[PDB]
Design a protein around this nucleic acid. Structure first.
Lengths: 122, 38, 176, 209
RNA sequence: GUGAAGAGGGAAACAACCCAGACCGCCAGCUAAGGUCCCAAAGUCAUGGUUAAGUGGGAAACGAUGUGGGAAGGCCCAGACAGCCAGGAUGUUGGCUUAGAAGCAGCCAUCAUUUAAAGAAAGCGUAAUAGCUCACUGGUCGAGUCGGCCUGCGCGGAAGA
RNA sequence: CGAUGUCGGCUCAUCACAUCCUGGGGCUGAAGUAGGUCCCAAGGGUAUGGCUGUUCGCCAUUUAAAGUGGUACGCGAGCUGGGUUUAGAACGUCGUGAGACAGUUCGGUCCCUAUCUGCCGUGGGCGCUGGAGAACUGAGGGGGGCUGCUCCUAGUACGAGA
RNA sequence: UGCUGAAAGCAUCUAAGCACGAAACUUGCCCCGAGAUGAGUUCUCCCUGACCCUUUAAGGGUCCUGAAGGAACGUUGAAGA
């Protein structure tokens, strides 16, 4: 459950550490983003030596949510924070080289193969 | 289809026809001369 | 009017029955029954057919003129019949026929099936040309029009279904 | 085709071999007994009237007792009838079991929804509440405007206002049938159905095939 | 002139529009404007025409083989108009602004042979060509046909909470 | 003028079609994707934020689209009071002055227990003809009607290629 | 968009006739619904005793019977101001 103005941590090592969600994509009047929905974010503070600077708008994908995800058998997965991965605004293509922390398997959409491969767990 | 209020024989191969109380112009050479309201 | 004043000779072996204003004609293909306008009167006129507009109708002559054309059309149809030729233009276009159903593939994702009406026969001497035959001209024209409507000819390559004896205008992109 | 009358019995879930859990509503469909068969000759339409359950002997009135006795059917609670599809026939006194749902896949369940009593516009029509602060005075959940001005001069019919909510019959359609148990008279349908536990439900095959 | 300071009847309702100026009573008659299929008093009245549009029962410039009437005019069984198997050629790829205009951009004449018959050129189409039609001319059926003016009544133009 | 509260915002809407999207078509200087223009169509749908009191507008990012208008420039006996528009005070300017300024700033009481019509719910009475208990037919009325992306067809038709 | 087709020998979707053709219209889906005074249909249940009076009428009065069923009261409800 990520909506506008929400703080997110960064799972990758692109140099960003905290980002603000400014829009939820994928539908008109969409309220909040799910486990693996694409969102538009702005970086609020990053590494000075990183390739992404403060106050830049680029897409992102949620990988972890505090609210959690629901499994088909009724189980749920919950995390202590919300995390995302950075993107390129033209092709999804996570720019990071490695991603820290667990990643749920809900991102297996025949496309996030790069995210799951770099995921230390699942 | 032109929907102008004035219809005329633009070319030689234009025929004036009345269909359902509407005066139409039909051309057998070029469709650009077809027009509905007359 | 002028056409109405021209009796049509009925050939031998054709039976004509005048039940009030209804006309039944039998030749060698089948029985054709048509209801005629109340403003036109018809008599046997042995060896010929004659039409006259009864007094009391302003358009009586016009109704006679169209009536005479219809009777001639049926007379020709029963005597010989009507044939129409349709051509399929385009790579990968098939017009296979079997029984009373026509199978066509005009580039659609699914096959096209057409159910012919009674009294109409379809033949496919070649994979792209289809010939239809029948006892009346109105039905054949309608069926051929329905077949053509499936893929209207387009003016860049003249593809789709077209009549055998029509000219399709062609145009080319001017710059792009 | 005809439906059946059953009683809602709580809810449960079924665990499949692949792991996914299916929430199912349990409907107790005991034998339904036909009490009257209608025909076009007499009633102008063809239908069968059925009964289910049991009633106290001293509680059923004489007019109802005679009606059941005519068909030779034991008195039950309430009466419901279903129109026929012209493709099947029935006889008076025949018993209909839940087995007829063995070959179906979607069903429509009809029942009386739970009664919420007099409900406000916010709860009834999902009206948006006004601001809770910034000067608002006694207008936190009020409906707001209900008309325009003199030019209409009236409130249009069908306006959304507070009133009775629930306690009307509603139909949930295209529900997957999960299991049918003839000997135990159970009908497991995936999803939730209107009404509370113990309420009478009508189950018929889905019409939106 | 009316209202104001005038009721009554008519225009659905509508001081100022039309008819008409209430002294009172009558379960008497004749009329005005306006009306006479039903609501709703009185012609489903008579004779000759028009309209096909629900026109009548909103609206223009302008458009159109709608339909009725009138005055004419051209061509017509030495056979018209529309159709049908026919013909439509030769220099004139022009001198001319030679970039190609050749009839199809214009300076320009707007010649001339075969002739039942054809122009140094009206349309579509090519850089120009080419090409396809029509001007015009033979033969069969074959009788009317063609283009304007005056107007009667209609149609389109004509979309709002 | 013996009083019809006049800008915005919120809540709640309803109608027109001169249609923003979705639907059906003609023409195209329409190869295809994507367009241009016109005709038919009102069933449904038809943004979130930054700045400003603002409507509007500019800007940022979405969507199939972020339609144009009427309804006392809809709606304050439904809400707010930011602007404007009482009394305080100050600045600039005009006036000798009191004061004034569609010049600008700071501050500044929004009453009503619903009789009638209307509307949303829910009952009593009588009727429907001997009375009563049930199950229905259905005149009629209302609700709902939105749509994106991915894959297959197919990398096919089209196209020199892209 | 058409097929056939005269008026007008041709042509022509139209004048006669016959075809297709949209989230619009009618229906199909769900709900209300016989106060639908045009008040509907079906099934079942209950009542089939006597006296008198007059301005002898679908009249009035008295005695005995009051059934089906309903209401009321009580315990109450995932029904409800």
């Amino acid at each position: 459950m990520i909506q506008e103005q929400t703080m997110l941590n960064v799972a990758d090592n692109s140099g960003a550490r905290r980002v603000m969600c400014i829009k939820v994509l994928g539908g008109s009047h969409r309220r909040y983003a799910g486990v693996g929905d694409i969102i538009k974010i702005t970086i609020k503070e990053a590494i000075p030596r990183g390739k992404v600077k403060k106050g830049d708008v680029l897409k992102a994908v949620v990988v972890r949510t505090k609210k959690g995800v629901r499994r088909p058998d009724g189980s749920v997965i919950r995390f202590d924070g919300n995390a995302c991965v950075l993107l390129n605004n033209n092709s999804e293509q996570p720019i990071g080289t490695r991603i820290f922390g667990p990643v749920t398997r809900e991102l297996r959409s025949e496309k996030f193969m790069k995210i799951i491969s770099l995921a230390p767990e699942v | 289809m032109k929907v102008r209020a004035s219809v005329k024989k633009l070319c030689r191969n234009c025929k004036i026809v009345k269909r359902d109380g509407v005066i139409r112009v039909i051309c057998s050479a070029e469709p650009k001369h077809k027009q509905r309201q007359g | 009017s002028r056409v109405a004043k021209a009796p049509v000779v009925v050939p031998a072996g054709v039976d004509v029955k005048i039940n009030g204003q209804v006309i039944t004609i039998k030749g060698k293909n089948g029985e054709l029954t048509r209801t005629l306008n109340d403003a036109v009167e018809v008599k046997h006129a042995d060896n010929t057919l004659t039409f006259g507009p009864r007094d009391g109708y302003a358009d009586g002559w016009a109704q006679a003129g169209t009536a005479r054309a219809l009777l001639n059309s049926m007379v020709i149809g029963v005597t010989e019949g009507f044939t129409k030729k349709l051509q399929l233009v385009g790579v990968g276009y098939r017009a296979a026929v079997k029984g009373n159903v026509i199978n066509l593939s005009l580039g659609f994702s699914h096959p096209v099936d057409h159910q012919l009406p009674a009294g109409i026969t379809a033949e496919c001497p070649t994979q792209t040309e289809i010939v239809l035959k029948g006892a009346d001209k109105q039905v054949i024209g309608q069926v051929a029009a329905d077949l053509r409507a499936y893929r209207r000819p387009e003016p860049y390559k003249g593809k789709g279904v077209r009549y055998a004896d029509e000219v399709v205008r062609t145009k080319e992109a001017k710059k792009k | 085709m005809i439906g059946l009358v059953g009683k809602k019995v709580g809810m449960t879930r079924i665990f499949t071999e692949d792991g996914v859990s299916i929430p199912v509503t349990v409907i107790e469909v005991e034998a339904n007994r036909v009490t009257q068969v209608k025909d076009l000759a007499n009633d102008g339409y063809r239908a069968i009237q059925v009964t289910t359950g049991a009633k106290k002997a001293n509680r059923v009135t004489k007019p109802e007792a005679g009606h059941f006795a005519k068909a030779g059917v034991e008195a039950g609670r309430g009466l419901w009838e279903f129109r026929l599809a012209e493709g099947e026939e029935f006889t008076v006194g025949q018993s209909i079991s839940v087995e007829l749902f063995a070959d179906v896949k979607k069903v429509d369940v009809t029942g009386t929804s739970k009664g919420k009593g007099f409900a406000g516009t916010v709860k009834r029509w999902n009206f948006r509440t006004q601001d809770a602060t910034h000067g608002n005075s006694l207008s936190h959940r009020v409906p707001g405007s209900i008309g325009q001005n003199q030019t209409p001069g009236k409130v249009f019919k069908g306006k959304k206002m507070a009133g009775q909510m629930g306690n009307e019959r509603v139909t949930v359609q295209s529900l997957d049938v999960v299991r049918v148990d003839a000997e135990r008279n159970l009908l497991l349908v995936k999803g939730a159905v209107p009404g509370a536990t113990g309420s009478d439900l009508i189950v018929k095959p889905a019409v939106k095939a």
